[PDB]
Amino acid sequence: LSCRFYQHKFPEVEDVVMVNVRSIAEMGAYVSLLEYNNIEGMILLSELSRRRIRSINKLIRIGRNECVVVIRVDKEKGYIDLSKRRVSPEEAIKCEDKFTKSKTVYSILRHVAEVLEYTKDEQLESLFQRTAWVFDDKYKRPGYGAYDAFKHAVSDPSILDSLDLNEDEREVLINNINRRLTPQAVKIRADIEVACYGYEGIDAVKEALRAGLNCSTENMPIKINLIAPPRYVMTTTTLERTEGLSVLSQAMAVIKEKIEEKRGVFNVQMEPKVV
Amino acid sequence: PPPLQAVLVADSFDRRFFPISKDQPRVLLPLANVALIDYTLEFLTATGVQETFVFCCWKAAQIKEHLLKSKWCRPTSLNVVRIITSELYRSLGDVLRDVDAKALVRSDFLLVYGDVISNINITRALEEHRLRRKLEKNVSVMTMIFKESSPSHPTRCHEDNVVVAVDSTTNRVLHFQKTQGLRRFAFPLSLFQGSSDGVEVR
Amino acid sequence: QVPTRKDYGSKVSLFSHLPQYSRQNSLTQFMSIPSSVIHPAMVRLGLQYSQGLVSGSNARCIALLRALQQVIQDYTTPPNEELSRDLVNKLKPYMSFLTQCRPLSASMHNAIKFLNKEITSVGSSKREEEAKSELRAAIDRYVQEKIVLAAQAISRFAYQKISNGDVILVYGCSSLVSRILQEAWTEGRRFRVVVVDSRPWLEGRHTLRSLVHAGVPASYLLIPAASYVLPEVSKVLLGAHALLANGSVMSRVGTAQLALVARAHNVPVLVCCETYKFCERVQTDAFVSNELDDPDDLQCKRGEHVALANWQNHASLRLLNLVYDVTPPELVDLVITELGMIPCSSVPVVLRVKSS
């Protein structure tokens, strides 16, 4: 029960690919292209490193995933020639990201096929062809297109409605997409010690706390609570932690300005951070 | 838990070093070409202390000047040192009263003197103290550190020799006294009424 | 496919990790007469390895390379395949069968590695006939420059050490030592040779006959009596089946003993070997890697009775027939190669300069 991650059965010249080493030979290293349904490949002895290499075991470490570009492809003999000395870190990291998103797509579609109890691999191939490759061709970008399409369809299932698989199949796919790729939950917490030893001490502290809490945006209520008599804690479970940290920093700055205006003292015990 | 803190009393409120201490504080006396304050600061830093308070009264200017040029006052030091001076200090009790007055500490700080040579890591002792405090709900107030030794060692001076009666199963101090000039030690019976199961005299 | 040869008798507990066969048991009794799985040339080569018709390391390497040239000549590339990989994949079972017939030697291992490298380097865009001809020519050049010219150079180098009126002690049978002695005698050196032999092969009679036919005065004795003749021996010249990367010399079973006894009598030790027998592996004893010959070869007739006739009946009785030993580098003075006269510790250095 397996299928290719992309529509092409064989990679084209100069495509950076994930491989998994399985043995060693005189020519080089046998591998299996993971996203091409475990077809065997070859990393040549003469392309392992830019420098002078002594042995195969120096760098291969059989049993480990590796990011290798391809130079020569021969489909009639099933010969695919790879190379490591030509890849670069940027290509390596983008290949890893592309591979992991394609793996997530394959995992969700395999789960759909399993929950629909398709024993034959041809049925799984048909399901993977109807949904993934349609969007991949529509966006003209293999790998990226499918993952982006499911990410968009997790919120609005209108795109997934155009699929012509089935009603139960569509329901299962929607449920899997909404239960797998919708982990939107983040908490930003901070601690601030603000107090004023003035005439209206408690009043100024309450006013500063209210002014800080008023800066809370929609779907992000800053639940300020008193941890210790001199120190309060701001906690807010809001997604998009990149914006949450900025919101917490702005609220802390506003509270500090309000406290300093009321002739008081304020300090930041702990900066905003995730839970 | 908050970062570990430490109160470092940089002035011994007793004159055991006349006339040497009349022109140089005992804290700045070179032991092995290195001042005692450096040794105790290194001990505090190596054991995980992240904030240190030095309370120096006698010749506090020299101590301040020496500390400011030391390694621990650099911006790269993980042990932040705060220098507080006052001419009104007369004893360690005054230092602790000032600490409570200004509320320097929040929980489970370290009390050491400015002339302590050590390499002790207090991680296990601190964990035991915190666990005991959590289980007993704020009953254990202090955990004193002792070193296994022999009465005949040169380090065991007659002045600071101490005999301690403890509960062997919970490491609780039940009685504590100094043996300066005493040829015979005495222990009250009230020790044995509570922890009759086990009592040790060390 | 080809089955596995059956172990014969009971092995020593310390040598239980090595295969031990019998000469009577042949692996070809379970293979088709017009052999298909194994090439007929390889079948004949394995048959004459197992029966002992080819013994010397140089002879074994030459026979392997000849049979391998025949295999390459008969080889035809399958459709929809590449020669540079199919040839190696086809050759591997032949090597496994040859190992089953008799464990491979260092020279054969080096030759196999050389041919694997040569085949791997064959271009994918060249004609089959050209590739086959180039492989045959490469095998011929390897044989020439690694045996013939090497032996000539080693003889020329060893002519310097051999002086007039000295005594040279040789052990076992080796073509290099015999050629060195014969050439030295031809050029005008006058000397004696003492031949040391050992059971059960008794292959020192080959070099004894060669020296007698060459006209060199010779003496013959068994190895236990070696300590008797070393007082009048001036040099100990030995042949090596392999040189290891740590300097240790792998050779016949008695060789190391001689070196030791030579060290007891203050006699210089020379080892002559060709550089293609240099091995990058290392071993410190004759236990981790060796070959157990037929135990029944240890039986000897002393009078009218054979003591070890039915040795299988005694359950606690074991026989081992070792064929190799390892000599530490501190018991060897000279190594004579086609590169020149080197110390015993320069073996890796040569291995470094022959690989680049």
Place this chain on the structure above:
Amino acid sequence: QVPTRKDYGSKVSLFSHLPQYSRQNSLTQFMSIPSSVIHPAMVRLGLQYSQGLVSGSNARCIALLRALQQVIQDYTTPPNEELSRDLVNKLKPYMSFLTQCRPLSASMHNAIKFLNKEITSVGSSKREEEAKSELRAAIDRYVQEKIVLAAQAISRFAYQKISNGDVILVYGCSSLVSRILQEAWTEGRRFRVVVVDSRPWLEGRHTLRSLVHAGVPASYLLIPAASYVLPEVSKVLLGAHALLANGSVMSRVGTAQLALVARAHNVPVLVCCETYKFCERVQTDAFVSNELDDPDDLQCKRGEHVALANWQNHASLRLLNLVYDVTPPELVDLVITELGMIPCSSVPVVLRVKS
């Protein structure tokens, strides 16, 4: 009959022929409280042997001889019996019990042989109290002239080998070495001593304390670091539990190792031993004859855990602590005896002139 002591734990395959007991398990659990089968002095001596209260070879021999004197004092010959062989027959089970408590040492073996020869030599016409008094006096004289006078003579002989400003390396604890060093310091020689110790007994602290109390400068280190201090060491002075007929020196486990490392550093080796510890037996290694101590003594607390706590749970794990080892005669330069300074190969000669 005295029950057979049970072996504790699993032994090494190469040492399966040697007994291995546990310090906690004693024979007296299966013995009458008022000792009847064996003399109370003998059971007391066996208990203090097994628990380790008597360790030194000379101390063990002296304690055994005192216990034997106590046994002889209370001995009463049965009617229609002769003392000469009845006493030996009575003593044999005592020796068996003592061997059960802990294997006998060379000094104890020689003392037993001497006492048996003395008892056999007692005439039949001798009257009981005179024979007992003669045996007691013979035991006392043997102790005197074989320990005290021998140690004095050896200390006098070793005074000439010790010069001013030299370094002497000693191993373990032995009364002879300590006496030699203290007397040499008293006479006026000035030197240093280096004390080498080994686990688990750690008995070098005894001689370290003795040297400190005597005033001799001393250094302390464990056996693995010995190869570090031998560059500055001038002589290696060792004590011997026994000298064998082939010249081999049987001693504590690290003695032969120290001799080998000292030979590697070109340091002379002196061995001090009394002629009553010379044995007619020979052995070429520490395997054929040795003693296995309690394996649980090897457990040590490093940090907060004992790595070998439940070592018997692991089926394939064995613990080995030898008690003695054998130094070949070629690693020893001097043997200092009351007869003088002799080569290591003259041990049988002494054995020839002492009988």
Place this chain on the structure above:
Amino acid sequence: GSELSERIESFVETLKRGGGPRSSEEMARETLGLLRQIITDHRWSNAGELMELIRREGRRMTAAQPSETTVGNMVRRVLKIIREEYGRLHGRQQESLHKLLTSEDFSFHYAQLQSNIIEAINELLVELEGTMENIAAQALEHIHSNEVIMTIGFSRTVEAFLKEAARKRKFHVIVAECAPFCQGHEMAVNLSKAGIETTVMTDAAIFAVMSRVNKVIIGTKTILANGALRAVTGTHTLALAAKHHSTPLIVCAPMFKLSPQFPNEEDSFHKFVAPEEVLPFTEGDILEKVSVHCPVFDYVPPELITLFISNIGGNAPSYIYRLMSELYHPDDHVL
């Protein structure tokens, strides 16, 4: 920037105060990562300036703890990598007679240099991943059936060696505890959990038991220029006993433990620690007059070593001079 300096301070403080990282492999990995960060997160114009910066950082790190030679080895490996890259990308060594008979500057910034260097470092890190497995894979060609192996102390490389060998053969292993830090107990119990039939003894019985030992397999802390070893204490005695009985002594050590220094720095060679382990503080007054020394390392001459097993295979101690000539440059020895 600031984070790089903070990491450098943390590394040097961890080095000079106590342990960390636990394993030598992890320490080498951390050193290489720190060197990579220094190369990237810092501005240098010429290759010589980068070499000077690396020299300063390596000098500080080695002065933090001279006994940890792996940091210096990584620094010198990085310097050699820089030299090789500059020479290859600028023009086209090792002071031989050939160069003397047939007859430099490190200026001239080239843009392609830096990235290349990084790649090389990554390659280095790659061979740090499979080094232990590479060493262990060749254990079956050195252990035969019913052999008697002897080991001193705790070594992860030797542990992997024996655990891989035990999957197909039965043999006996004796472990001598390395007093005072009896770390041999941990290795003994670890081997016993694998059913290797292990025996434990104190390291005072090395000579007595060597007569029945077939092979000695040990680890090491540092391999010196002439093939000598800086090993745990008691290893010199073990080697002496093995040489006396002519039992081969195998050293299983990776290639990053090779240090181009010679044993003439005897003063800092051993690491002397508190004498509490040897003689406890509870002894009393005798501690006033007694000198106690507790070295944890000792020097083993190359003549007592039979073989060197590393991730590149087997070698003799006579070949070590070549290996370092392929790893470090002669001008980088002093650093």
